[PDB]
Short mmCIF file of C-alpha atoms and ligand atoms in Angstrom, two decimals:
data_model
loop_
_atom_site.label_atom_id
_atom_site.label_comp_id
_atom_site.label_asym_id
_atom_site.label_seq_id
_atom_site.Cartn_x
_atom_site.Cartn_y
_atom_site.Cartn_z
CA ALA A 8 0.00 0.00 0.00
CA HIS A 9 1.64 3.22 1.23
CA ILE A 10 5.34 2.41 1.70
CA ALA A 11 7.41 5.11 3.42
CA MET A 12 11.20 4.85 3.11
CA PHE A 13 13.44 6.87 5.49
CA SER A 14 17.09 7.83 5.23
CA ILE A 15 19.73 10.56 5.69
CA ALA A 16 21.60 12.69 3.15
CA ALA A 17 24.59 10.39 2.65
CA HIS A 18 25.34 8.53 -0.57
CA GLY A 19 26.30 5.36 1.28
CA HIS A 20 22.88 5.26 2.97
CA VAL A 21 20.72 6.06 -0.06
CA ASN A 22 22.38 4.71 -3.20
CA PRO A 23 22.42 1.07 -2.00
CA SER A 24 18.61 0.86 -1.94
CA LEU A 25 17.50 3.08 -4.83
CA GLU A 26 16.54 0.25 -7.21
CA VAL A 27 14.45 -1.58 -4.57
CA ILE A 28 12.39 1.57 -4.01
CA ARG A 29 11.99 1.79 -7.80
CA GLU A 30 10.80 -1.80 -7.93
CA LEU A 31 8.11 -1.46 -5.26
CA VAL A 32 6.95 1.59 -7.20
CA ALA A 33 7.05 -0.36 -10.45
CA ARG A 34 4.89 -2.95 -8.71
CA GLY A 35 2.22 -0.33 -8.09
CA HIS A 36 2.66 0.65 -4.46
CA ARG A 37 2.55 4.27 -3.40
CA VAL A 38 6.05 4.97 -2.15
CA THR A 39 7.24 8.04 -0.27
CA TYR A 40 10.76 8.81 0.91
CA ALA A 41 11.77 10.99 3.87
CA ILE A 42 15.02 12.77 3.08
CA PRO A 43 16.67 16.15 3.57
CA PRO A 44 16.19 18.58 0.64
CA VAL A 45 19.64 17.99 -0.92
CA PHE A 46 18.69 14.44 -1.90
CA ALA A 47 15.05 15.21 -2.77
CA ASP A 48 15.82 15.00 -6.52
CA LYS A 49 17.99 11.90 -6.07
CA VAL A 50 15.17 9.87 -4.55
CA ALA A 51 12.50 11.46 -6.76
CA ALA A 52 14.11 9.89 -9.84
CA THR A 53 12.58 6.61 -8.64
CA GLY A 54 8.91 7.60 -8.72
CA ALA A 55 9.02 7.83 -4.91
CA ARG A 56 7.47 10.97 -3.45
CA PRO A 57 10.01 12.91 -1.38
CA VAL A 58 9.06 14.11 2.12
CA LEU A 59 11.49 16.84 3.24
CA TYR A 60 12.83 17.01 6.80
CA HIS A 61 15.78 19.07 8.03
CA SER A 62 18.95 17.20 9.10
CA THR A 63 21.73 18.22 11.49
CA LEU A 64 24.21 15.65 10.18
CA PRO A 65 27.06 16.60 7.79
CA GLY A 66 26.06 17.08 4.13
CA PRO A 67 26.50 14.37 1.48
CA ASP A 68 29.35 16.41 0.00
CA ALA A 69 30.98 17.13 3.40
CA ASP A 70 34.34 15.57 4.33
CA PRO A 71 34.46 12.04 5.88
CA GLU A 72 36.16 13.42 9.00
CA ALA A 73 33.05 15.55 9.58
CA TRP A 74 31.40 12.42 11.00
CA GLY A 75 33.81 12.21 13.92
CA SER A 76 36.73 10.01 14.88
CA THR A 77 35.85 8.64 18.31
CA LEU A 78 33.14 6.14 19.29
CA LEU A 79 31.01 8.74 21.02
CA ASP A 80 31.61 11.34 18.29
CA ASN A 81 30.45 8.75 15.75
CA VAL A 82 27.20 7.79 17.50
CA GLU A 83 26.09 10.96 19.34
CA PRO A 84 25.15 12.82 16.14
CA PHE A 85 22.61 10.18 15.09
CA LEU A 86 20.71 10.53 18.35
CA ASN A 87 20.82 14.32 18.31
CA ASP A 88 19.63 14.37 14.72
CA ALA A 89 16.83 11.90 15.52
CA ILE A 90 15.54 14.03 18.35
CA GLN A 91 14.99 17.07 16.12
CA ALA A 92 13.96 15.02 13.06
CA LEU A 93 11.25 12.94 14.73
CA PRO A 94 8.70 15.73 15.30
CA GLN A 95 9.07 16.93 11.71
CA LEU A 96 8.30 13.47 10.38
CA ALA A 97 5.53 12.61 12.85
CA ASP A 98 3.84 15.76 11.56
CA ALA A 99 4.38 14.84 7.92
CA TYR A 100 2.76 11.42 8.15
CA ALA A 101 -0.22 12.31 10.34
CA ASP A 102 -2.26 13.47 7.30
CA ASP A 103 -1.27 10.20 5.46
CA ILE A 104 -0.11 7.27 7.68
CA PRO A 105 2.02 4.86 5.66
CA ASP A 106 1.28 1.13 5.61
CA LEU A 107 4.87 -0.10 5.90
CA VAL A 108 8.03 1.64 7.07
CA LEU A 109 11.33 1.08 5.25
CA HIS A 110 14.49 2.64 6.59
CA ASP A 111 18.23 2.77 6.38
CA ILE A 112 19.95 1.79 9.64
CA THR A 113 20.80 5.43 10.46
CA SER A 114 17.22 6.64 10.84
CA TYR A 115 16.12 6.38 14.47
CA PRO A 116 12.87 8.29 13.79
CA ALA A 117 11.73 5.60 11.36
CA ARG A 118 12.01 3.01 14.12
CA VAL A 119 10.10 5.21 16.56
CA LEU A 120 7.37 6.13 14.06
CA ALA A 121 6.86 2.54 12.87
CA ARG A 122 6.14 1.53 16.47
CA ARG A 123 3.89 4.56 16.86
CA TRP A 124 1.92 3.43 13.81
CA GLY A 125 1.63 -0.23 14.80
CA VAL A 126 3.09 -1.16 11.43
CA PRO A 127 5.97 -3.38 10.25
CA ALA A 128 9.39 -1.78 9.88
CA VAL A 129 12.00 -3.21 7.53
CA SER A 130 15.58 -2.10 8.13
CA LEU A 131 17.86 -1.92 5.08
CA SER A 132 21.56 -2.35 5.92
CA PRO A 133 24.27 -1.36 3.42
CA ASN A 134 26.92 -3.09 5.54
CA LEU A 135 27.41 -6.03 7.89
CA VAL A 136 24.91 -6.69 10.68
CA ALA A 137 25.04 -8.12 14.19
CA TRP A 138 25.44 -11.88 14.54
CA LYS A 139 24.26 -13.97 17.47
CA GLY A 140 27.06 -13.22 19.95
CA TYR A 141 27.73 -9.65 18.86
CA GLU A 142 26.59 -7.87 22.05
CA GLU A 143 28.89 -9.92 24.35
CA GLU A 144 31.61 -10.49 21.78
CA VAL A 145 31.89 -6.99 20.31
CA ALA A 146 29.46 -4.31 21.58
CA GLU A 147 30.46 -4.77 25.25
CA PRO A 148 34.29 -4.37 25.11
CA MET A 149 33.74 -1.53 22.69
CA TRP A 150 31.54 0.35 25.14
CA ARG A 151 33.14 -0.63 28.45
CA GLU A 152 35.61 2.26 28.79
CA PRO A 153 33.55 5.10 27.13
CA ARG A 154 30.12 4.19 28.60
CA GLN A 155 32.04 4.32 31.86
CA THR A 156 32.97 7.98 31.37
CA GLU A 157 30.57 10.70 32.56
CA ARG A 158 30.17 11.55 28.87
CA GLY A 159 29.21 7.97 27.95
CA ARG A 160 26.86 7.35 30.88
CA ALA A 161 25.07 10.60 30.06
CA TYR A 162 24.74 9.69 26.38
CA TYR A 163 23.06 6.41 27.23
CA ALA A 164 20.85 7.94 29.91
CA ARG A 165 19.71 10.54 27.36
CA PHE A 166 19.07 7.89 24.71
CA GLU A 167 17.07 5.83 27.22
CA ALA A 168 15.06 8.85 28.35
CA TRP A 169 14.19 9.75 24.77
CA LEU A 170 13.02 6.21 24.02
CA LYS A 171 10.97 6.04 27.26
CA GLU A 172 9.09 9.27 26.46
CA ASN A 173 8.21 7.54 23.18
CA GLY A 174 6.80 4.50 24.97
CA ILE A 175 9.85 2.44 24.08
CA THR A 176 11.29 0.41 26.97
CA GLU A 177 14.00 -1.01 24.73
CA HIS A 178 17.54 -0.48 25.86
CA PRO A 179 19.12 1.86 23.30
CA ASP A 180 21.51 -0.84 22.01
CA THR A 181 18.71 -3.23 21.17
CA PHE A 182 16.68 -0.37 19.61
CA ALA A 183 19.65 0.77 17.54
CA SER A 184 21.58 -2.40 16.66
CA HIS A 185 18.93 -5.11 16.66
CA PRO A 186 16.07 -4.61 14.18
CA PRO A 187 13.22 -7.12 14.27
CA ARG A 188 13.48 -7.49 10.47
CA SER A 189 16.36 -6.55 8.17
CA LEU A 190 17.45 -6.95 4.55
CA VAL A 191 21.21 -6.78 4.10
CA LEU A 192 22.55 -5.27 0.88
CA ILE A 193 25.97 -6.90 0.94
CA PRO A 194 26.76 -10.46 -0.07
CA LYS A 195 26.82 -12.79 2.93
CA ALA A 196 30.35 -13.69 1.82
CA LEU A 197 31.40 -10.31 3.22
CA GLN A 198 29.60 -10.71 6.57
CA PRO A 199 31.78 -11.67 9.55
CA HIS A 200 30.55 -14.73 11.48
CA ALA A 201 28.07 -15.54 8.74
CA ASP A 202 26.49 -18.81 10.01
CA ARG A 203 25.68 -17.16 13.33
CA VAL A 204 23.54 -14.36 11.88
CA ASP A 205 19.83 -14.85 12.60
CA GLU A 206 18.12 -15.78 9.31
CA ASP A 207 14.63 -15.16 10.69
CA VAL A 208 15.58 -11.52 11.27
CA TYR A 209 18.16 -10.96 8.54
CA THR A 210 17.98 -11.89 4.89
CA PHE A 211 20.98 -11.17 2.68
CA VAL A 212 20.02 -9.96 -0.79
CA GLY A 213 23.36 -8.45 -1.80
CA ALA A 214 23.90 -5.65 -4.32
CA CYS A 215 20.89 -4.06 -6.03
CA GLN A 216 21.49 -2.44 -9.45
CA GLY A 217 23.25 -3.68 -12.59
CA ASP A 218 25.44 -6.81 -12.50
CA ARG A 219 26.46 -7.48 -15.08
CA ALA A 220 27.94 -5.22 -16.06
CA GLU A 221 27.37 -1.46 -15.59
CA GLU A 222 28.22 0.10 -18.08
CA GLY A 223 30.43 1.26 -20.98
CA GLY A 224 31.35 -0.61 -24.15
CA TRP A 225 34.74 -1.98 -23.03
CA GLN A 226 36.61 -4.43 -25.27
CA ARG A 227 39.44 -6.80 -24.35
CA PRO A 228 42.38 -6.48 -26.73
CA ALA A 229 42.52 -9.24 -29.31
CA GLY A 230 45.53 -11.18 -28.06
CA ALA A 231 44.99 -10.67 -24.33
CA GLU A 232 45.24 -13.90 -22.32
CA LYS A 233 45.06 -12.26 -18.90
CA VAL A 234 43.46 -8.86 -18.29
CA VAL A 235 44.16 -7.18 -14.94
CA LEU A 236 42.20 -4.20 -13.66
CA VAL A 237 43.56 -1.83 -11.03
CA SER A 238 40.60 0.43 -10.12
CA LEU A 239 40.30 1.65 -6.51
CA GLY A 240 36.77 3.05 -6.55
CA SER A 241 36.30 6.77 -7.04
CA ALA A 242 37.60 7.84 -3.62
CA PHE A 243 40.90 6.48 -2.22
CA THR A 244 42.68 7.00 -5.55
CA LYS A 245 45.49 9.57 -5.43
CA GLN A 246 48.56 7.45 -4.78
CA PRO A 247 51.96 8.28 -6.25
CA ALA A 248 53.80 5.19 -5.07
CA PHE A 249 51.40 2.52 -6.35
CA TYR A 250 50.07 2.73 -9.92
CA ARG A 251 53.64 3.18 -11.17
CA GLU A 252 54.29 0.04 -9.10
CA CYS A 253 51.49 -1.77 -10.90
CA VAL A 254 52.91 -0.73 -14.27
CA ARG A 255 56.21 -2.28 -13.34
CA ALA A 256 54.60 -5.57 -12.30
CA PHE A 257 52.59 -6.13 -15.47
CA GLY A 258 54.15 -3.81 -18.03
CA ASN A 259 55.71 -5.79 -20.89
CA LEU A 260 54.66 -9.02 -19.16
CA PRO A 261 53.86 -11.37 -22.08
CA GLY A 262 50.20 -12.43 -22.17
CA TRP A 263 48.96 -9.72 -19.79
CA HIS A 264 47.04 -6.52 -20.42
CA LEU A 265 46.79 -3.94 -17.65
CA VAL A 266 43.84 -1.57 -17.43
CA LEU A 267 45.10 1.06 -15.04
CA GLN A 268 43.35 4.06 -13.61
CA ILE A 269 44.06 7.25 -11.71
CA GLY A 270 41.56 10.11 -12.04
CA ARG A 271 42.36 13.52 -13.62
CA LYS A 272 41.69 15.02 -17.13
CA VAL A 273 44.83 15.35 -17.43
CA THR A 274 47.36 14.20 -15.99
CA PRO A 275 49.11 10.83 -16.66
CA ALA A 276 52.24 12.59 -15.88
CA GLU A 277 53.83 12.33 -12.54
CA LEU A 278 55.80 10.10 -14.95
CA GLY A 279 56.37 6.82 -16.80
CA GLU A 280 57.21 6.36 -20.51
CA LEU A 281 54.91 3.31 -20.19
CA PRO A 282 54.89 -0.21 -21.71
CA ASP A 283 52.59 -1.00 -24.67
CA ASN A 284 50.34 -3.44 -22.81
CA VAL A 285 49.12 -0.83 -20.33
CA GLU A 286 46.11 1.45 -20.71
CA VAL A 287 45.51 4.32 -18.32
CA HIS A 288 42.26 6.11 -17.56
CA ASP A 289 40.63 8.70 -15.35
CA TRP A 290 37.68 6.40 -14.70
CA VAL A 291 36.28 3.15 -16.19
CA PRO A 292 33.06 1.24 -16.67
CA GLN A 293 34.46 -0.92 -13.86
CA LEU A 294 31.74 -3.52 -13.61
CA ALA A 295 31.98 -3.76 -17.41
CA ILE A 296 35.75 -4.33 -17.34
CA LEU A 297 35.64 -6.87 -14.48
CA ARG A 298 33.11 -8.67 -16.67
CA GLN A 299 35.96 -9.88 -18.88
CA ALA A 300 38.93 -9.34 -16.55
CA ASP A 301 40.93 -12.21 -15.07
CA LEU A 302 42.39 -10.37 -12.11
CA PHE A 303 41.36 -7.38 -9.99
CA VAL A 304 43.79 -5.35 -7.87
CA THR A 305 41.38 -3.63 -5.48
CA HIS A 306 41.39 -1.53 -2.30
CA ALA A 307 38.62 -3.87 -1.06
CA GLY A 308 35.99 -1.19 -0.62
CA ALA A 309 32.43 -2.52 -0.35
CA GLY A 310 31.59 -2.00 -4.03
CA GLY A 311 34.80 -3.33 -5.52
CA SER A 312 34.72 -6.33 -3.20
CA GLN A 313 31.13 -7.07 -4.18
CA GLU A 314 31.95 -6.54 -7.86
CA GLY A 315 34.95 -8.85 -7.82
CA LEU A 316 32.89 -11.66 -6.31
CA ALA A 317 29.93 -10.89 -8.60
CA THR A 318 32.16 -11.37 -11.64
CA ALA A 319 34.19 -14.32 -10.29
CA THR A 320 37.39 -12.30 -10.60
CA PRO A 321 40.25 -13.30 -8.28
CA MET A 322 41.56 -10.32 -6.34
CA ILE A 323 44.72 -8.83 -4.91
CA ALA A 324 43.40 -6.84 -1.98
CA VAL A 325 45.69 -3.99 -1.01
CA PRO A 326 43.86 -2.25 1.86
CA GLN A 327 44.47 1.43 2.49
CA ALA A 328 41.83 2.77 4.91
CA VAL A 329 38.71 2.35 7.14
CA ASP A 330 36.70 0.59 4.40
CA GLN A 331 39.10 -2.21 3.79
CA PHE A 332 41.05 -4.35 6.32
CA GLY A 333 38.27 -6.76 7.26
CA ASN A 334 36.91 -6.87 3.70
CA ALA A 335 40.39 -7.79 2.54
CA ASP A 336 40.65 -10.37 5.33
CA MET A 337 37.32 -11.86 4.33
CA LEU A 338 38.18 -12.04 0.62
CA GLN A 339 41.37 -13.61 1.84
CA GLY A 340 39.51 -16.16 3.96
CA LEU A 341 37.19 -17.10 1.10
CA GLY A 342 40.33 -18.37 -0.63
CA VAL A 343 39.71 -16.09 -3.60
CA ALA A 344 42.21 -13.33 -2.91
CA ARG A 345 45.56 -12.33 -1.49
CA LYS A 346 45.89 -9.46 0.99
CA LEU A 347 48.90 -7.17 0.54
CA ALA A 348 50.13 -4.22 2.58
CA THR A 349 50.71 -1.24 0.25
CA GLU A 350 54.38 -0.88 1.17
CA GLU A 351 55.49 -4.95 0.33
CA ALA A 352 53.58 -4.91 -2.93
CA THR A 353 56.69 -5.09 -5.06
CA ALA A 354 56.51 -5.59 -8.79
CA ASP A 355 57.82 -9.10 -8.24
CA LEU A 356 55.38 -9.87 -5.42
CA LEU A 357 52.45 -8.31 -7.31
CA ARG A 358 53.40 -10.32 -10.38
CA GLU A 359 54.02 -13.50 -8.42
CA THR A 360 50.72 -13.10 -6.60
CA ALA A 361 48.91 -12.36 -9.86
CA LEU A 362 50.29 -15.46 -11.50
CA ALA A 363 49.49 -17.54 -8.41
CA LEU A 364 45.82 -16.49 -8.49
CA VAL A 365 44.88 -16.55 -12.16
CA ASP A 366 46.08 -20.12 -12.64
CA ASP A 367 44.20 -21.90 -9.87
CA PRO A 368 41.10 -23.94 -10.81
CA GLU A 369 40.30 -24.05 -7.10
CA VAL A 370 40.37 -20.29 -6.61
CA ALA A 371 38.06 -20.26 -9.61
CA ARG A 372 36.17 -23.12 -7.94
CA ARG A 373 35.51 -20.92 -4.90
CA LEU A 374 34.49 -17.91 -6.97
CA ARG A 375 31.95 -19.90 -8.94
CA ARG A 376 30.32 -21.20 -5.76
CA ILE A 377 30.20 -17.60 -4.49
CA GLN A 378 28.38 -16.28 -7.61
CA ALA A 379 25.87 -19.12 -7.30
CA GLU A 380 25.29 -18.08 -3.70
CA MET A 381 24.95 -14.41 -4.65
CA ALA A 382 22.45 -15.30 -7.39
CA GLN A 383 20.28 -16.79 -4.65
CA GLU A 384 20.49 -13.50 -2.77
CA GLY A 385 18.84 -12.38 -6.00
CA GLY A 386 19.36 -8.64 -6.10
CA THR A 387 16.67 -5.97 -6.39
CA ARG A 388 13.46 -7.73 -7.49
CA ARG A 389 14.33 -10.14 -4.66
CA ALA A 390 14.52 -7.37 -2.04
CA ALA A 391 11.10 -6.25 -3.28
CA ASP A 392 9.60 -9.74 -2.81
CA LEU A 393 10.63 -9.73 0.85
CA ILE A 394 9.40 -6.14 1.34
CA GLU A 395 6.15 -7.12 -0.33
CA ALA A 396 5.95 -10.05 2.05
CA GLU A 397 6.20 -7.76 5.11
CA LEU A 398 3.76 -5.25 3.65
CA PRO A 399 0.74 -6.44 5.62
CA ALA A 400 -2.60 -7.49 4.06
C1 ERY B 501 26.55 -3.87 13.07
C2 ERY B 501 25.35 -2.99 13.51
C3 ERY B 501 25.84 -1.57 13.70
O1 ERY B 501 26.47 -1.20 12.49
C4 ERY B 501 27.79 -0.67 12.60
O2 ERY B 501 28.47 -0.90 13.59
C5 ERY B 501 28.41 -0.36 11.26
C6 ERY B 501 29.35 -1.48 10.94
C7 ERY B 501 28.98 1.06 11.35
O3 ERY B 501 30.06 1.23 10.44
C8 ERY B 501 31.36 1.10 11.02
C9 ERY B 501 32.37 1.03 9.86
C10 ERY B 501 32.65 2.41 9.26
C11 ERY B 501 33.78 2.32 8.28
O4 ERY B 501 31.47 2.91 8.59
C12 ERY B 501 31.15 2.27 7.35
C13 ERY B 501 33.04 3.32 10.39
O5 ERY B 501 33.42 4.59 9.86
C14 ERY B 501 31.89 3.43 11.35
C15 ERY B 501 32.23 4.35 12.49
O6 ERY B 501 31.60 2.13 11.91
C16 ERY B 501 27.89 2.03 11.03
C17 ERY B 501 27.61 1.95 9.51
C18 ERY B 501 28.23 3.48 11.46
O7 ERY B 501 27.83 4.39 10.44
C19 ERY B 501 28.89 5.15 9.82
O8 ERY B 501 29.37 6.06 10.73
C20 ERY B 501 30.41 6.88 10.31
C21 ERY B 501 30.83 7.77 11.46
C22 ERY B 501 29.90 7.72 9.13
C23 ERY B 501 29.43 6.80 8.02
N1 ERY B 501 28.91 7.53 6.86
C24 ERY B 501 27.70 8.25 7.15
C25 ERY B 501 29.93 8.46 6.33
C26 ERY B 501 28.38 5.85 8.55
O9 ERY B 501 28.12 4.90 7.57
C27 ERY B 501 27.50 3.81 12.77
C28 ERY B 501 28.03 5.07 13.39
O10 ERY B 501 27.69 2.76 13.67
C29 ERY B 501 25.99 3.97 12.49
C30 ERY B 501 25.21 4.36 13.78
C31 ERY B 501 23.82 4.81 13.40
C32 ERY B 501 25.09 3.21 14.76
O11 ERY B 501 25.56 3.32 15.89
C33 ERY B 501 24.36 1.92 14.38
C34 ERY B 501 23.22 1.75 15.38
C35 ERY B 501 25.29 0.74 14.40
O12 ERY B 501 25.79 0.57 15.73
C36 ERY B 501 24.69 -0.59 13.91
C37 ERY B 501 23.97 -0.37 12.61
O13 ERY B 501 23.81 -1.15 14.82
O1 UDP B 502 36.97 4.42 -11.95
C1 UDP B 502 35.99 3.95 -11.34
C2 UDP B 502 35.99 3.94 -9.96
C3 UDP B 502 34.84 3.56 -9.27
N1 UDP B 502 33.85 2.91 -9.93
C4 UDP B 502 32.71 2.37 -9.17
O2 UDP B 502 32.54 3.14 -8.00
C5 UDP B 502 32.26 2.33 -6.88
C6 UDP B 502 33.32 2.54 -5.81
O3 UDP B 502 32.87 2.02 -4.58
P1 UDP B 502 33.87 1.27 -3.58
O4 UDP B 502 33.14 0.92 -2.33
O5 UDP B 502 34.47 0.10 -4.26
O6 UDP B 502 35.08 2.27 -3.25
P2 UDP B 502 34.94 3.73 -2.58
O7 UDP B 502 35.15 4.71 -3.66
O8 UDP B 502 33.61 3.92 -1.97
O9 UDP B 502 36.00 3.81 -1.56
C7 UDP B 502 32.23 0.90 -7.38
O10 UDP B 502 30.89 0.51 -7.61
C8 UDP B 502 32.98 0.95 -8.70
O11 UDP B 502 32.52 0.00 -9.63
C9 UDP B 502 33.83 2.91 -11.31
O12 UDP B 502 32.86 2.45 -11.92
N2 UDP B 502 34.91 3.43 -12.00
#
């Protein structure tokens, strides 16, 4: 019926679920989407009707450091934003109560309002979720020393008091970290402690968009036996001492063709006369390239990691920052990748690693079983089935 999606103005919390919104609309449901004004047009592209609230969180364009760099500086803003957001949204939906509530993990008001409405809420997570064990295993030692501070005790007391005034007796950690129903938009292959996640609460549906492969008419060179892509997303990609290191590993290496990227307009020219079997770019139809590639040197960001698995492309994971270590360790543990520190990645080690991965029927054997498992996660139309299933009679 009336499906109301909720999120914040951050690409990583809106882009993952765009196509599922689109699908429920394409079905014939009336879908509205609570969002700050900056992303009004972004969500509107999907048929969804925007519903504009004001946010106090950093803007989508704002720097990553704007979100804080301590545990309490990371979490406090989501509560403070919720407190001022909630009464805007409660107002907005009074003259049109939605039938089902959809929401990104960051929206506390969606949780509160869904309970207020007596309607199902479905949480959409663009990253890993809690497993059975998480509170004792991970949430507790994380919170022991900060919750203990006057600052931490006060944060939790405030969170509790806000919930209680809303008729919610939930402890804030269960309210925040433990949804009653969740769809997870990463492959389960990239979820730590995968068997121990609660399937009756969480269903993994993986990426939702275009595999494969979005989208630009790339062509492997006639002659190429082994194509390698180096393509570190569109963010962590301004490294002097690395691409030139990749050129040296694969440049003039018989049989291999290197698709290399950087990101200017301009400029290929910090240096390197360059071998003939190397092509450089500012940007690529990455999914499209991986669709024929035999090897992927990746920073192991969420997208790249998903895309490598989606295309059964063995990976050299060379982690660089906050998005990466665990992802690289998991790709590692799947037996489909090698983790390298930036950084010892010598030309000889990169080459040796490359060779060691592309000629392994077993590495390929693991990647094929992963794609089969991802195909069961379905994608978009699948996420809509489950959301249609929760969308009461
Ligand atoms: C498991 C279940 C928990 O998920 C997490 O632990 C994941 C694994 C964090 O990412 C991890 C991993 C990482 C890299 O974020 C991807 C890290 O930066 C943060 C601090 O923790 C998330 C998503 C963080 O979001 C990120 O916070 C950053 C400050 C800004 C970033 N974005 C808006 C720019 C945003 O996505 C952050 C703060 O926990 C979200 C707030 C709302 C929470 O406290 C919620 C309730 C979480 O505890 C949780 C959903 O229950
Ligand atoms: O030159 C590029 C770089 C990035 N991407 C796409 O941009 C996304 C990058 O996301 P990821 O999580 O991998 O890295 P991030 O940039 O967020 O750190 C992925 O879907 C890539 O396929 C692309 O198509 N061409």
